[PDB]
């Protein structure tokens, strides 16, 4: 089951739902997050961001004043739509509410009816908008939550049932998908002769992706809405991460694309299951290529199961990767020790581990150090927890600021998979 | 000044930022964020400060605010628990609580929160009420030295100088930097400087500084801005108060950490003290210089286009400017008035109305003067590696290295570095 | 220019000829590497490639006797081959020269023919001939000796000219490839519409690549004798790595196919030039996935270009790998402060050091403390001297037998270049 | 015996490196090795020991024989100036020269050599004649051990025990261990045992061993063959030579530590040395078998298919064996007449002919008594592996860990590991 309990948080596991959400829309293509909320909110997740992806990141905020006591920030919102939309005119806006704009319940949807009457402004500028108070879920949750209304409000409804037309592929990717999962996700597809459309997509926007000499709002993107709009159409969706049925959910009473979700996509079975779904949506059969790495893998694991086989684990992350390394340790004979998770979310039964928290960082040391963890996968964050046990670190995870390749790790299917076990086999080695 | 027009250079961060960077080094307390996680989460591994020490302010601590917790009421309860945490877990001499947009909004009462926890558990817990929202950066910087008002006040009196004992010196010179924040360890290159002199530092007001550290202030017999005009009002808070002297120096360049030390020489005043300064400047910048003509070839006649943001970035300029290069500076008409004046002396009366834009003016305006690199601070980072163009940080929070005498040693090693590198040319 | 010394090895950097050449034989499919010496010096290879692989590796003993002061071995390497031929029954044997047997001559070509008289055994059975005193050379050149002879062994000759049919690609592969780099060398042709034809290719030998409970001769092989036969006709062929000069002339003689040789696949120009020579050796244009890599690499030398530019680098690798670390590392202002080889080797002009020496791992030790190496690139046997000064290690080359990951390692082209700018990065940061 | 057929189980390697199995473990020597690369270069990695000190062990030396070196009689220049140069470079206790085929066969002069070095240099240097083509490992065991006799003969007498001095018991009793190599460090497991019965051990052949302790092995009181009996040369040397008597006994199971133990007791003859070791063993045997019942579910009837490569693995056999599971043991013509006297105690009179077939005979005679683990040494580990078998390396090099009373902890942990993994039916 899942444990909580109070009071003060101390080096906290959790950011926020209005971040995660915010990289979401990050993954749009010529796109532009905006906070409705003060402007060290964003000053702040621009900081978390650009130090992750070592690369410049959009973001823009609402500048709520002290004022935002009196006129909810109506002049505010407005203001900063018509302000970007002339500035840099993005493909996509996204309107996210903070914790202090959601206060008073803030008028989402009405500001931006405020900014659906005046406008001179086109128009023809589609905006997200989403709620995401910085006080409820978190980065992953964040996340999902503006790809519910990122489906939701681009072209989801008119057409139906007979808009299932080419062999294009939807996936619904999770916020703990990276660029180098992303192109493993897109290459793998493509390579069934399918046809991928991810959504969204930071495999396009982030890393070093661009040509000209500055690049204001992104345009180093992910999705077109112009393509995304033709997500209604399309043999099936694949849905990556169990974050996302909610947006799963969205996505298939608009249109009638049937789903086949979930893992992370870690360990056999995982990626078996991935190939398969993929072999029966197109006929064709498994590429040689991956049949020549489920025997890489099957190797690896026979090379690092005298290590790994009934390690101690301790692992602090969102509830997705938190399955995902459960699942690919347990078919190793890892024990996961302690579990330690930044909100309830979905995954319930708790997956097969008998229980996991909600209490990040301070509670992973002492949970860890309980029964006896002998490594440790986390985030940056993490280094100073495992430096103060006695142990290795793995990050993996959206924090990770110390680490140069880290962003843009390939952690799944079958070399995702078995470079993994390499790394734990070799941090367990060496430390002992 | 600062007002802030939305999505134009409106970005900076708030008060509660400006004040958790001059509390934060501050390294045995414990340093509560009282918000939801968009104040704290991120903010946390956080940049600069090198402790000698107790790694406490390093420590992510946050009353977590659900939603439920919002629906009035409950906002206080949490807080005063969550000290209660705090002093129980880690016994830290004091404790400190930052205050936010949310609890701010809500009518949260901090300061009585504190002085309630203070009383029941016996720990001093010192309320910064800073809040987002009430402004800038520099607005927080403000508000911390105001609740250092109500610490500083001589809660305690300066230690006995320990046995050691440096003999025909008065090493009973005590003295505070305020603004100091060792960052990168920087400060470690000064002090020993300090110590030769024979000024002990009462407090590095945020470098490497313990919470006992900033009680002994008022006792200090001269009192330096190093840099930072945002706590001008410390100084002379200090001076009115106590009757403590001022002045301001950087410790950035040949000139300013000679200039830096040639007036406290003469502010304190000694015979003894101010024959010994021109000896140690005397020493050092013999030093200096020579280690640097190697240098002087490789840097020299390189042009730099120079961005303030809230970086204390005209210290940088007197280093680079004595090496030889030249310097071209601009701020944003939300710049301080500080910027705008010293951007006129440097150069041209008239443009520091370089606008809100980003890259858009900035880029640009590197290239029309052909500059070799821009400095600036780790936001314009990446429009300058991106527009191709070579870069160096303004932070001494960084792992470099810049202030005195031996400072600048890395920092021609950091500038060659970035523009030497082969790299350029490949993009 | 190139200094050497003498007179006792300190932790010798060098392996032998007859073992390098025995990997080479080893990237052939159902192939047999086979000794001429006595059994320690196979038992002695045997481990050495195991313990790197961590996979099972077929070598046998000519089992010379204490009497090899008598019948040469004659009798000795004739049992041998008819041996294996009918108890394995091998699509190709490797016959190598060790130090002792080559102390008198030892009648190879003859000992072969005296195996080309009696031979109920078949014959069809290809045998490859190479001399390889451990006295002499070293590893890679030992490598690109068997390349000669593969090359030579296996239908150079009669056609010609007029065999030079399809759109097939030769790629003449050196020691320092692993399966990882040549996947990339072959994927990399594969997408411009070619076909590579590897020689060898370890790439098929060396994994975890078998369903068989046994695989006595390595059947799971790099190159067919059958499909190398087919080399004689192809379009052109490409040498990758400088210590195949001698086989690209072996190879370019016997038929008349034009050889575009040379670099480790590293760094901005490396692999620009290598896919520039395939774009003109096809016509088709570069694939948008390697121009976009490209970018992604131009981004990671401007993330990493603070930390690398003018590191000091200590390098103690066979000579490719060196000219390869070496360029890959001066793209980025990065001095080789101290580059320590096995021997001689062509790569005269030094390539652009001033200097290098041939004298092992004693010699790096002093040479990097000399000119003070923030970072020492190497194999497993480095870690000592890496440790003994205050220094990261970062290992390459051909012993890593304390490393999971390592034989299998992709170094090359645009991901492989910006993730060896990754990892010298975070090792050069979290030592400072 | 031992003969060898051409590609017929044909590996084992040469008498050089089983000489350099058995001298290696002397830690503080220089270990030059005479030959070209095929010789030195892999062997140097190694294998197994650990030391508690000195690691020059640990550094490759080899005189590093070019072809113009063996366009004869360079061979013996080099040699003598590179221990000339390990001499001076290192300073040893002493150096140990190692000969190898091809400077065998040219006629290379290695006594003579060493023995100049030696006298003009002033360290003692001790041939070892095993080129590879005189025989198997074994046999370089052997000739290993002969060289100790021009090393062992009180070239010095035993230290006075330290003044620490364990009062009541006769803490002068000394002994040897022949043959234990401390490999994984698994003798820091025996050795306080040893101590508490106040047994000196003035050397472990080859076991955390220095030069200056091999030179006091006359003296001992009782010698003890651990395992090798590729050994009991030196035993019956030493006992021959100087009186000494001895037994043999492994430190692999309960068992045999307690029978080792025993026999020590009544081999150098003490009543109060005897009450001591039952007392010993007595709380020992309590000790283990208390951690061992968890575990016996576990493993309890497991089937295991036992090869033996050299290793000496009927001492592994004793352990198992009592814990519970069914052991099929096998040895290969190439066996000693050790192996195949054992086998045949073991089970059957009949096979120990399994051929020099690999993993043919192997894997399959695994299926055949349907195995549950294969148990040989690392070059029959792949063939486990691949063959989709669990396995067990017959190393005590390793880094486990499986004698005295504390090793079947862990010997009992790396079984379970293994063929409890979730990894073997997933392949
Ligand atoms: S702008 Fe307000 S809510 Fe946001 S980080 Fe600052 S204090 Fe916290
Ligand atoms: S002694 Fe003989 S078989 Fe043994 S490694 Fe040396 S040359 Fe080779």
């Known amino acids: 089951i899942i444990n909580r309990n109070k009071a003060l948080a101390v080096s906290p596991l959790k950011a926020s739902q209005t971040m995660g959400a915010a990289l979401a829309i990050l993954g749009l293509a010529r796109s532009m997050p905006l906070f409705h909320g003060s402007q060290g909110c964003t000053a702040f997740a621009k900081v978390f961001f650009v130090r992750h992806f070592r690369e410049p990141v959009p973001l823009q905020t609402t500048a709520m004043d002290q004022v935002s006591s009196v006129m909810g920030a109506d002049e505010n919102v407005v203001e900063a739509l018509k302000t970007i939309c002339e500035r840099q005119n993005p493909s996509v806006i996204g309107l996210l509410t903070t914790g202090l704009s959601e206060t008073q319940g803030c008028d989402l949807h009405t500001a931006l009816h405020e900014f659906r009457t005046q406008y001179e402004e086109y128009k023809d500028v589609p905006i997200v908008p989403v709620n995401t108070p910085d006080f409820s879920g978190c980065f992953e949750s964040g996340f999902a939550a503006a790809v519910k209304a990122i489906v939701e409000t681009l072209v989801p409804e008119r057409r139906d049932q007979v808009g299932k037309r080419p062999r294009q592929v939807n996936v619904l990717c999770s916020a703990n998908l990276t660029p180098g999962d992303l192109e493993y996700i897109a290459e793998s597809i493509e390579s069934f002769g399918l046809r991928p459309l991810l959504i969204p997509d930071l495999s396009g926007s982030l890393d070093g992706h661009l040509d000209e000499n500055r690049f204001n709002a992104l345009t180093t993107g992910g999705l077109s809405v112009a393509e995304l709009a033709t997500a209604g159409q399309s043999v099936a969706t694949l849905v990556v991460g169990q974050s996302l049925a909610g947006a799963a959910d969205a996505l298939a009473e608009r249109t009638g694309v049937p789903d086949r979700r979930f893992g992370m996509l870690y360990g056999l079975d995982a990626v078996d299951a991935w190939l398969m779904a993929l072999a029966e949506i197109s006929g064709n059969p498994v590429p040689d290529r991956y049949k020549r790495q489920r025997a890489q893998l099957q190797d690896a694991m026979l090379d690092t199961h005298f290590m790994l086989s009934s390690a101690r684990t301790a692992i602090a992350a969102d509830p997705d990767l938190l399955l995902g390394f459960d699942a690919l340790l347990r078919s190793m004979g890892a024990h996961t020790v302690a579990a330690v998770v930044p909100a309830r979310a979905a995954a319930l039964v708790d997956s097969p581990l008998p229980s996991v928290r909600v209490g990040d960082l301070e509670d992973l040391e002492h949970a860890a150090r309980a029964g006896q963890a002998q490594l440790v996968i986390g985030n940056s964050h993490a280094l100073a927890s495992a430096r103060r046990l006695g142990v290795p670190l793995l990050r993996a995870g959206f924090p990770q600021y110390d680490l140069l390749g880290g962003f843009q790790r390939c952690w799944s299917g079958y070399r995702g998979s078995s470079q993994v076990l390499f790394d734990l086999a070799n941090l367990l080695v060496e430390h002992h | ?427």
Chains 1, 3 share one sequence.
């Open chain 2, 1 to 427: 000044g600062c007002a802030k027009p939305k999505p134009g250079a409106t970005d900076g961060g708030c008060s509660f930022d400006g004040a958790q960077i001059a509390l934060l080094p501050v390294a045995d307390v414990a340093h509560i964020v009282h918000g939801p996680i968009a104040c704290a989460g991120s903010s946390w591994d956080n940049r600069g400060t090198r402790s000698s020490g107790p790694d406490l302010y390093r420590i992510g601590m946050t009353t977590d605010l659900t939603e439920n917790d919002v629906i009035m009421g409950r906002a206080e309860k949490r807080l005063f628990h969550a000290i209660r945490q705090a002093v129980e877990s880690y016994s830290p001499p004091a404790v400190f609580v930052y205050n936010t947009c949310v609890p701010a909004l809500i009518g949260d009462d901090v300061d009585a929160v504190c002085k309630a926890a203070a009383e029941r558990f016996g720990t001093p817990v010192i309320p910064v009420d800073s809040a987002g929202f009430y402004g800038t950066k520099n607005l927080g910087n403000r508000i911390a030295g105001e609740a250092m008002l109500k610490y500083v006040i001589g809660t305690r009196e300066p230690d006995p100088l320990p046995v050691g004992s440096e003999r025909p010196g008065i090493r009973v010179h005590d003295v505070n930097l305020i603004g100091e924040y060792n960052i990168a360890g920087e400060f470690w290159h000064v002090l020993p400087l300090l110590d030769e002199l024979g000024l002990r530092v009462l407090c590095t007001l945020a470098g490497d500084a313990r919470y006992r550290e900033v009680q002994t202030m008022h006792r200090a017999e001269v009192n330096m801005m190093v840099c930072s005009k945002a706590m001008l009002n410390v100084a002379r808070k200090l001076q009115e108060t106590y009757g403590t002297p001022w002045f301001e120096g950087s410790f950035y360049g040949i000139t300013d950490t000679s200039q830096a030390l040639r007036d406290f020489a003469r502010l304190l005043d000694d015979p003894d003290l101010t024959a010994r300064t021109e000896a140690l400047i005397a020493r050092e910048e013999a030093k200096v210089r020579a280690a640097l003509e190697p240098w002087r070839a490789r840097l020299e006649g390189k042009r730099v286009l120079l961005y303030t943001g809230g970086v204390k970035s005209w210290s940088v300029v007197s280093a680079l400017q004595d090496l030889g290069m030249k310097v071209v500076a601009t701020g944003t008409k939300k710049s301080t008035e500080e910027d705008k004046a010293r951007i006129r002396e440097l150069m041209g009366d008239d443009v520091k109305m370089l606008d809100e834009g980003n890259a858009r003016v900035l880029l640009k305006t590197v290239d029309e003067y052909q500059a070799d690199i821009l400095i600036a601070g780790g936001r314009n980072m990446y429009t300058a590696l991106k527009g191709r163009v070579p870069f160096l940080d303004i932070n001494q929070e960084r792992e470099f290295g810049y202030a005195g005498y031996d400072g600048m040693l890395e920092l021609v090693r950091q500038l060659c570095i970035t523009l030497e590198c082969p790299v350029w040319e490949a993009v």
